[model samples]
Target chain A: PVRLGRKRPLPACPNPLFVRWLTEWRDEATRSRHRTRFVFQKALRSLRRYPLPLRSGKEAKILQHFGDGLCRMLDERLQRHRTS
Target chain B: VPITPMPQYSIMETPVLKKELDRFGVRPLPKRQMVLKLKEIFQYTHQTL
Candidate 1:
């Protein structure tokens, strides 16, 4: 477990759809490289849509966790991507 | 949109790879190793493309 600064409460997003979509995208049968590209693209797109004024250390932690998880998921998907 | 040709098998540019690592909040020594692995993987794929 990596400790990043002091933990602060993040605001709850109104729509759960974004999170749902993220989970679906990860679970989909996409190529690993494509999944990675899509996840990063989604993050960038989300930032563009809802720009953070000043990210709390906790917010950064959340983002980092999601990014790392996405990468791991991509690695799993990549093996399948290679075979098919 | 103007399209640019993708390179065949160029090494991953250090600055760009570093930028991505930083963006993902990878820290210290591990970041270096991860970036190197990503570069090697990309290079292998570039050859196939």
Candidate 2:
């Protein structure tokens, strides 16, 4: 195979914490039919595609699937992580 | 006789799309919405491929 590497910058996952939280939420659903399953999937994909580091969940609201409820959850966890 | 391939919509077809969507464990949505999101995420995956 030719050795040309990727020229464009790929979006790196900014926050592994957010990704892990979403993964936990996803697995607990236990069924594909559960809406949480898809919602988390969207959140995970959006987070993965995001190029910028999110300082707070409010900053994430511009992305798809990062709804108010989801943002709050992230924010609360972030707060706890900061405080403790 | 010459062998000819039939034209088919590979990614947009429902059955095949459903399998990939299921493999990713995406929840159900209206058919059109489902296809749209699947295409979006699949496009991202293919970018790295």
The model with the greatest TM-score is 2
True contacts kept of each: 0.01, 0.00
Tell me the whole-model lDDT of each prediction, alpha carbons only: 0.41, 0.63
Candidate 2 TM-score over all chains jointly: 0.51
Interface RMSD after interface superposition, model 1: 16.7
Worst 10 residues of 2 chain B by lDDT: B1-10
- 10 residues in a row with least lDDT, candidate 1 chain A: A1-10
Q: Write the per-residue lDDT of candidate 2 for residues B1-49, one digit (tens) a residue.
A: 2222222224356666555455543444556765765545544433322
- Tell me the spans in candidate 1 whose CA falls farther than 4 Å from its real position: A1-84, B1-17, B20-29
- Give candidate 2 regions above 4 Å deviation: A1-12, A31-33, B1-49
C-alpha lDDT of residue A9 in model 2: 41
DockQ of each: 0.02, 0.04
